[PDB]
Ligand binder design. Sequence first.
Ligand SMILES: [Mg+2]
Ligand SMILES: [Mg+2]
Ligand SMILES: [Mg+2]
Ligand SMILES: [Mg+2]
Ligand SMILES: [Mg+2]
Ligand SMILES: [Mg+2]
Lengths: 253, 253, 253, 253, 253, 253
Amino acid sequence: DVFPNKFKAALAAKQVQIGCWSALSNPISTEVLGLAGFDWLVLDGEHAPNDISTFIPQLMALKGSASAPVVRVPTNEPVIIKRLLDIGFYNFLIPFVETKEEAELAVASTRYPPEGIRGVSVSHRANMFGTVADYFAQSNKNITILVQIESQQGVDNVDAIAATEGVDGIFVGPSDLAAALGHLGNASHPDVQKAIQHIFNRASAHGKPSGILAPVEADARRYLEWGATFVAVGSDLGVFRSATQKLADTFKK
Amino acid sequence: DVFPNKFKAALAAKQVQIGCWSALSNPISTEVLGLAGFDWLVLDGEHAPNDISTFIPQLMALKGSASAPVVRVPTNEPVIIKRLLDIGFYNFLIPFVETKEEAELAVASTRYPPEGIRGVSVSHRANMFGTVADYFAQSNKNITILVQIESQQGVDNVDAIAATEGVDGIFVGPSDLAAALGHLGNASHPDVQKAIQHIFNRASAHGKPSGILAPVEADARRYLEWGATFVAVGSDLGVFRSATQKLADTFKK
Amino acid sequence: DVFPNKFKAALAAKQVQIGCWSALSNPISTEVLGLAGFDWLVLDGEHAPNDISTFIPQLMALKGSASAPVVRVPTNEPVIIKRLLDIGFYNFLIPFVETKEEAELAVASTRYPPEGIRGVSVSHRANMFGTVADYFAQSNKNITILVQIESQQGVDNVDAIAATEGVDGIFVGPSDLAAALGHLGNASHPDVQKAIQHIFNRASAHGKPSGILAPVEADARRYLEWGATFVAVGSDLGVFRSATQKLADTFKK
Amino acid sequence: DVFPNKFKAALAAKQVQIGCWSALSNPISTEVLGLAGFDWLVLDGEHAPNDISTFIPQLMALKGSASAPVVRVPTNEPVIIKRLLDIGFYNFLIPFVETKEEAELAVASTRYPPEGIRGVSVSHRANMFGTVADYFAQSNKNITILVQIESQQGVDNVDAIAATEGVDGIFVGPSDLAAALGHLGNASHPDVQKAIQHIFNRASAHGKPSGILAPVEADARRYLEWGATFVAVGSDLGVFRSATQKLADTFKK
Amino acid sequence: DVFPNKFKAALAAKQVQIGCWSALSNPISTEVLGLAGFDWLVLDGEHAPNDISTFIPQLMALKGSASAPVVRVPTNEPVIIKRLLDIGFYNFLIPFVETKEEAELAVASTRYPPEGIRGVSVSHRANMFGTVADYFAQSNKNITILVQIESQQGVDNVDAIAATEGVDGIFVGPSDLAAALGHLGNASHPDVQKAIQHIFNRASAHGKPSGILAPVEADARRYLEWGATFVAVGSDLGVFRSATQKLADTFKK
Amino acid sequence: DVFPNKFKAALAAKQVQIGCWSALSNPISTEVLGLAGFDWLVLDGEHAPNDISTFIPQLMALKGSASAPVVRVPTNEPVIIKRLLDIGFYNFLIPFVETKEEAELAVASTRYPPEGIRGVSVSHRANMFGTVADYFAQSNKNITILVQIESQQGVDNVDAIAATEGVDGIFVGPSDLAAALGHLGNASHPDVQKAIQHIFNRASAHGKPSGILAPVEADARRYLEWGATFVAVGSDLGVFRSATQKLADTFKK
Ligand SMILES: [Mg+2]
Ligand SMILES: [Mg+2]
Ligand SMILES: [Mg+2]
Ligand SMILES: [Mg+2]
Ligand SMILES: [Mg+2]
Ligand SMILES: [Mg+2]
């Protein structure tokens, strides 16, 4: 069925999950993206022009795809999380999780009371309009929470955050983290690299898997060796941009 | 014209208002829905994939319909209420109203200062681009506020909330209330039923009409006898789901 | 997988196929429709505001559904059929098939040279962008063609039409045949019924299953009793319309 | 109500009908347009990016407006007319009507058998999903057909075209007639004016009102002075374009 | 390139910037609007049905237009500002800026740390998917911040707000300010007029240019003489409304 | 400016034009595509889900791009060409041009009387709503017509087709020509290659540049080696598909 969340389970068994970012915000290219074979695709709702109106068509486009659909909320607040849970998202990427407090809110937003604060609707895409067996009971256990550590504060509290019940994975937002460490546009800086591995280290420390976005293969391969399990190796936008540009160059120079 | 708000008046005279929920989020089916004859249709902006972009087409679809269009905001905050008032909504359903404070904010968001905090625009669907006579003066008296009591806190303060100036009706969100009372997916529980009637009782106590959503006819008929006036007897989604499924079954078993 | 076309197979085996019409023209309701369990759903591109931009979302909404998607082209002409083939439709309903040549044209429009005149593209939804095995070869033998006999001339040539290689099923258009016989709005007329019966015998006469649209149950059972195998027992529009009117009535009457 | 068609009646009575063209192709501005007070608005499907997906929202936007909606089909052919009839258009403008047969074809395209070849559907916007009384019967006598004489051949056959049963008004296409006479961009040319005058007399000659599009006031008054009854005095596009240019100029010049 | 922000520079040199408001929320009319010649066009995201989904098409429509695109956020909060910066907005109008605090938040939301709190994305419309030279460094200096003073509190602190680093212009929202001063719908009241000039006075006092919206020419000309530099002389909606209505009247009276 | 048509000029000068196909049907990715640097991009309206509603946004997305936008009409017929001309397309690709008459029809469809049969409108994207100088005059001599020889009959008449006044370039459709020769899926077949070579010589024979679609590099170089000037070296779809599959593979294999 919809449950159990196989993606959430792969993360638990700390298996390597290869993902790709999506920002093209449309069902046509996203259906093609789902054929690639990635383990998870992040439908970016924060840095990509995506909203409820584009999320649903794309989620339909991904039906029958092995890739686990993950939504990256525009911010960590309960209302949007609620709306995103009902339209059919079972995995979440929460930008800028700086405290254990925030980490809990995020988890609570994906859970029906008393376990959480999720609002209850009786018919929607999540429970496929009432066709999902034992929905209410199951739902609260089949939602993946991926918190992004991309601020100094988030780093300082990485340990508490990773220990939080519900937090299924620790994700590192390199670009934001680099800017946060006074190295905007320079994540490769040894300063950023040390902060990145630290987060990984602590993630592993609390049994939670770590993850990161890294369109550069070398970095991707380095992070995987550092232990990271859910790693995004690129984005539809990026590969499309490079591939097309490259194609033009091999004929025009 | 647009004023006076006849729906707001029916509620005041505590007449029985039979409504239906809408979640299909589109102008085509919603135009058909408007032919049914319901007294009010709730265009759900909280648990249904609806937004400004879908609300307007549907509001146009409902033009010439007896049904009073009611928008169920995604949450109780001034900005979205403001935007929803300008596109042409004169009746509001406010989710999770737990305190008299919140109840006031909600009312204040639908009123131009000093009476409230509503932002002023000079041409929009609300004043039909300047063709509504004495708009500014009238507007502040023709907006229906329906607060949802669906939390324990909301219950505890039902009395204060119902006494609030502006609050035109007390609505009970069964599912959320049930989850709030430790009975997720079991609103029929005598515990929930007692909390429901209590809210009704208090609504009546302060001269304000009470309301509820109940797709099951028996419950609907029971709540009406308990006194509830604005009752939603179903949703486009639900009747569509049952009707279609049923149709398939009478031929395939 | 895409191939073989099970719907095409079932028809050939003359087993009863229970379908529903679709005019709501939107992914949200059609996804809910796909849950009903019909053996086939007709995305009407002739009398409903559907087109390529509404078809893809609805086709995606039906992914996973047991229902076989069937598109009713606005008219029998190569170009639109060409385009509809590539967006993912494997089953077609052709309106106003009046002669053997037109029937031929329809079949040809769905097959690659030299079997037919279908245009060639290498990547589209039909072959799921190069993932469907032996696409070219298999596609030509996996397209269901359902012709509509809904006119005087269509009846006169019913035998020639039914004997055409590629015509997988003879469909009767009650409203249009009735009008063709000077009985607009009265399909139940003896003259009309007689023709429907005739088309069915001539269809069975050539070992081709017969079909028709019967929104009224008593008629659906009558036609099935006569031996029609693929019968549409209603439409999402008519069901939604009727069910919402009924719900309103039981409480406002 | 839908029937009788008041616009159709007014024309027959040769009373002046003042209209405006629409090319903006969107519900928002067209709703504002519907407030102006024109007796008729032309939703151009020939030279504006309009189509069935933009028509329904705009048709809904015009509900309540005193303006009679008129659709300008992209071309004179049965199928598109069939589809446009069902989405809610009761008035049509046919481009390039050059012969009596074509004029005939147009009328026939809007009438059910045996009067015409219009396809039959039982539920759509035209009959407001089964709510319009005696729809079939009344529809055939309530469709306004406005033919455009904008070509040499159209002028030669103006009398035959005007005498056709069903042709409710003769419309002149200034830009196209001008081009047909070798005067592209110069409709004010004596040769062109002469033909416009001629078409008007031949129209009046058969008791059929005449019409034309005159964005320039002096021309509008001239044509009205000549006796044209349904005159389009401009377009939303031209007005918006001109008014915004003027506003910019008065402050930046 | 994209940088340097010429509009931001014109404001600095306190040149007269003639702008127009946009609320029609669509690419078709907005492309025409861009031909008018205004120095800046405010794509209203607060009182007009605009969102990310409509903003992008319109921004593309404005490409190659002299007009500087300005977005009027729905409210002053970092998340939406972030999303609006990535889709391609370089100039912002911030509604209801009442304190120096708020003024700073607004500026900080448009700046990458440490200078601000802007979230970092590597490929988007702002840096044209990586083709803008020295983006990160440049961006933080090429973003225009226009704060709206339209409350009593905002007035009381006009001085502190105008002195804030980042604030590029002081804009007066007449309608809201009037309502704020107990004169809803009467901005011409000497009370409002005195508050307006005060704001202007203080804007100039801190070297920052002042601005205002005034569809009435007299007021527009008066404010310009009072010193205001960035003045919106109308809106697409308003000129469209007046122009169309006027056109109908010159022919029907 | 719009005129002269530089792409039309380059072709006439037989200089190499490097293009890419577009089927993604959306403004977001097409804007990124426009950055690649191709001399021309084909917005496919024949084998991709593109149409007037997707074309305008994409056309706007290409404003500023050095790439010349080319539209591939669904089929060679006056009406669709008429409409596509007005929305802003100056370059056309005509599928299945089999005879000299059809080639003629295509050219005529793009020119105003008496040169052709193009319909006349005074304000649209083509003349940028009356801003393009001497539009009527210049437009007729600035429309690029690229005909596709992709059928047996098209090859037989290649010389007559190439000698037609207005035919700016002979394009070969590999997939369709191959099917026409009984080599579906095998364009590399000697029989097919022979015809492609032939069409190229007959094209060069009449001083008309030749073109073709070659997604595989080795073929692109081969055809360019043979002297083809306008060659499409791929499609956004194929590139995106291939690049995303590759990225997934390098980490999951
Ligand atoms: Mg980040
Ligand atoms: Mg609730
Ligand atoms: Mg029919
Ligand atoms: Mg014309
Ligand atoms: Mg304001
Ligand atoms: Mg081809």
